[PDB]
Amino acid sequence: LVIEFTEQTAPKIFGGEIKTHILLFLPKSVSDYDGKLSNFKTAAESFKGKILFAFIDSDHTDNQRILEFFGLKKEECPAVRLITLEEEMTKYKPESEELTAERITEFCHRFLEGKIKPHLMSQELPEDWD
């Protein structure tokens, strides 16, 4: 499954058992939105129970704190960031901006294989997110 990450769903997303998340920041106005989402959903199927797939509508005004927290501006999306919470917060970036199921899947495999450069996030999780 792929869930929508909003402020309303953030607790449900970080308050779970899985502590690896991939986040697709996808402007709802992007060309072929359903296409990009489908690709992300297809990729999700390969990582059930290992990586939780979530998407953020980066166009949505109430998602501004979420954007800012993960270091992104609206004009920089669509973008993917993989986050680990076991146990200091760490952010990982794909090699390419390409958002195909194959490239998202490879990103995730590379991360599991320990191939991706880590980037500590020094901000504490918002109180709201649990």
Quick one: which of 55, 42, 58 has its CA closest to 13?
A: 55
Look at strands 20-25 and 52-56 and give their pairing: parallel
Report the distance separating Cα 112 and Cα 116, nearest Å: 9
**In residues, how long is the chain?**
130
Number of domains the chain contains: 1
Is residue 51 within 8 A of residue 58, CB to CB? The reply is: no
**Domain CATH code at residue 50:** 3.40.30.10
In the PDB record, what is the listed experimental method?
Answer: X-ray
Residues of the chain immediately before an interruption (C to N > 2.5 Å): none
Domain span at residue 41 reads 1-130
Resolution for this PDB entry, in angstroms: 2.2
Measured at the CA of 20, the angle between CA 15 and CA 23, to 5 degrees, comes to 90
